[PDB]
Amino acid sequence: GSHMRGPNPTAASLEASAGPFTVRSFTVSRPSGYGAGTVYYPTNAGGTVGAIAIVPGYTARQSSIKWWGPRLASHGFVVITIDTNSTLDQPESRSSQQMAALRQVASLNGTSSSPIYGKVDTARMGVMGWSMGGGGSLISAANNPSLKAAAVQAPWHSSTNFSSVTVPTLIFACENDSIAPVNSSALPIYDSMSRNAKQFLEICGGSHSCANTGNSDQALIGKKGVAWMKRFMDNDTRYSTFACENPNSTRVCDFRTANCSL
Template sequence: MKIKNRTACTTAAPSPARRRLAMASLAAAGLLCSFTAQAQVAVFQENFTSGLGSFTAAGSATNSSGAARLAGCYGCTDGAITSGPISTVGFSSLSLSFDRVTSGLDIGEGGIAEYSTNGSTWTALETTRATSNGRVTFNLPAAAAGQTGLRLRFRIDANLSSETYTVDNIQLTGISGDGGGTNPHAKGPAPTASLLEASTGPFTYASTNVSSLSADGYGGATIFHPTNVAGPFAAIAISPGYTGTKSTMTWWGERLASHGFVVAVIDTNSIYDQPYQRAPQLMAALRQLVTFSNTSSHPIYRKVDPNRLGVMGHSMGGGGTLIAARDNPTLKAAIPLAPWNTSTNFSSVSVPTLVVACESDSIAPVNSHASPFYNSLPSSTRKAFMEMNNGDHFCVMNGNDFTRIMGKYGVAWMKRFLDNDTRYSPFLCGAQHQADLSNSQLSEYRENCPY
């Protein structure tokens, strides 16, 4: 929230003659200020706790005492830092705040803050010298909203290396388009059928590997995480099936990360691990994601919300998903995919669970696995059952024919229950969902709406 907005909400006491009218005005102003405080959420932030963080450097640009220090240079390149692309899709009323300090600048020199919507044309927000130190806030024009590649740049125009411009605690905030802006977990534009059915969502993402030697309690992982939108994000761990590896499930990691989740697609300790062994490995992976998020040198530093965790898995990994949901009621969502398990009783599960089945599954036949698993879930638990028409046991893996509809429901389920984002409810219960029931790729769908 901007300091100047707080100041604007401070009003002197009215004269007696105008007290009633003034008190009514103050009450209205108080409501307006309260709404604005709720509506402003972080779109992007950088505190330079780990080098220059998400910024790339040119010229003399270094991390000094946890801030970006830019120095001048005579006859060579002055210091500058430029952010990667930042998604402002789904946000309005953007505001940029940062701390800056200049030192030794002469007339005609300055520290410059600017932004670009295309990466080539830059608009200056300010050029400052030593008399303008402190924290500042700038309201960006409406054209900066709704961009997939907004960039920020800070640079110095000076002649000497002793002349510096130091920047820290950069924060870009905006009003989220979540139907009022009151949900801090809601990220991205309002969902549409075409957005959910596309192969990737609104955010760019990166991946990083966890080796078997670095993994704590599981066999290794590839972590997929958003790169052009501020966290923290809900986190999801995904297990492959019997004899499978993480490489069979990467499409889920990519799809979910591009919609604003941190996703660990894991290898298990043994490809022959049973469901009861995969469940604790899913939880171990989630715990390590939280640890990585608390480690300043890790790529997912500050990206994981430890209170919003979910699990997924295929086949025996799906059985492990159900067991993890049963044994860890603090989980927020679960999606077992063509699940296999020796027990069909999950009557104590309270975690919202979407069971995905493959109609022609001969390895985990629907009538003896996915269907009784779903039926055993209590009616008090938010649940759904989705069966892929004529799909075999591998219909949920990479290269399947159901990615549009399956990815749509997988993302919507996680958005609704991990992010508490009710903008996705119509795709699970409402008119959008009803339209999908005639989709030829669905052979059956059950649910206990509303949610």
Template sequence: MGFRSAIHAIPALALLLVGVTTPTAQAADNPFERGPAPTTASVEATRGPFAIATTTVARSSVSGFGGGTIYSPTSTAEGTFGAVAISPGFTASQSSISWLGPRLASQGFVVITIDTLSTLDQPDSRGTQLLAALDYLTRTSSVRTRIDGTRLGVMGHSMGGGGSLAASRTRPALQAAIPLTPWHTTKSWTTVRVPTMIIGAESDTTAPVASHSEPFYTSLTAAPDKAYLELNNASHSAPTRANTTVAKYSISWLKRFIDNDTRYDQFLCPAPAPSTLIQEYRATCPHS
């Protein structure tokens, strides 16, 4: 019996204690909650509250993707963590998205930034490789005991972003996807059932939002939750270097949907207004 049910069964006088047991109530409602209550400062910080370790994954030691780097919290005192695999884009290596590894892991996720089998791999192949990387993380990696294999997500830049859409279409059990200035020749993703945040860039000439991010977002009719964030006056490569806006909303999305942590709703709903950083934001507010 959960906290909210049990509390009705105790004597009326004990109800006076409800105010002081609110944290227990939250813990009972959400066993996946990790870390302190978020603030704007905490989600915008370059590092979160968790100390992390870095592990190199040699290409020769894995199959299905080109190796990579694992960033993981060093302590599991609060429990296991959700995991995220991130793919680079066309012609790029993991170095182009490596800044996201420690940024996300220190907020309470196990993260693997991958190299692809070939830098010329197309989006669907990158999607398959993202899933192979998640399978490696949860089944055979040295950090597998730190991971809750039911709480997984994917991210990627450019063709890697298209790959994250393809991975979500293939594996609807994923909890979250964040395509970053995504590129894909497929424009309709009506079968994707994964909560998806698409981050586009206003001045992107490689994957213009009008022919990529925007139709991708519009087509996500089966996704239980979705969001579209367009970076103001930004280029296709904006997500390949440290970007506070990308980090803030990626952390919030992953926390909300991989960790079911409603404390992060405040950053997603109501939708942030246009600003010097955000050209446009569209969303379905997260469902409880």
């Protein structure tokens, strides 16, 4: 049950600012259940692709996480980046809004006038987010085990207990995070999860925004992010080593993985 799109990956191709597919985007005219949305999609993936909803953190907007949209879409995903109803929404409300964005992407997939009409496999969905939107993504995964993958950056929630998550979950953490300190937030989140494929990659010297638009590790962070979603959303074993391996990089101060074969 593989869903392979595009050429065989290399380090160079996964590190580049763009993957193989040409990307277009549009603003959602009437966002249903969230504040605002931009959809990024490939014109030419050669088959239906999975969908990914990305949520920013507390006080933040789409600009903080926007770089993910073209980056993921160019490798064969429909990506929606959202603004929340309020910038001060808490994680549980961010999760609801993320799932509302995925719902609306599935609806647009069925709308003949939509630029993504027939482009989405609505059975294959994934969640991403930063900080409270990272917590929101983990709540989405806990609540909706049919989700195929989760990739979060510097996640925070009021509980670190995500022991019920069965969804393959990648956590980017930022070593010098002063907002959601790694050793009391991202790490115990990672450690709580015992039923899934999971990975933890802490960015050496990173502040809270170390995985946000314009960061200096887009080659590595982008490569790992794309590999993870390709491996788990497309069941694409051409990506098993990129997704599961320790990069052994001086850009990473801590790396952990479990239940991640090849």
